[PDB]
Amino acid sequence: SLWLSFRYEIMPLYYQSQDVLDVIANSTSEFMTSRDFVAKAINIGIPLE
């Protein structure tokens, strides 16, 4: 009975702790990206001769 009472006393903290803090940690990070392009010109010289 004492063990069960201690159980009932602690798991309020268990609920206040574990699921909430784990989901708080989980609610972080995700994939995203950005991109762009150009038609930049690269020139190589050739002598007129």
Binding site: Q16, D19, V20, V23
Partner: protein, 129 residues
Amino acid sequence: ANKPMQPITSTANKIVWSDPTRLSTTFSASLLRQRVKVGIAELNNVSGQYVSVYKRPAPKPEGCADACVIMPNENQSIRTVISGSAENLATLKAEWETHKRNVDTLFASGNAGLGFLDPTAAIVSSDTT
């Protein structure tokens, strides 16, 4: 020019505000979040319940704002409970001002505070044409 207040009780769930000048008035905010699968899919439901109470004694008999005539105090309590999915918070916000104006039209600008009711009052929804 509005006097601010400062917290009284600090908790992971509840924050109690109150004016140092007038301890009668207070504003507190407690919120509970629940881990829910409505359509066999997980949802982030957060239920933020807000209370704002002011003890304002204002019977003030006609034209008697004259002298040291104290009146007993009366309650003015405002209860708001907002619950919804955190993922849809952006549109949940959008619904929120619709609730503002809807109440404002029928009550703030309307005459529902006296206890009357107008079914013909303009009531509008969140979505647009």
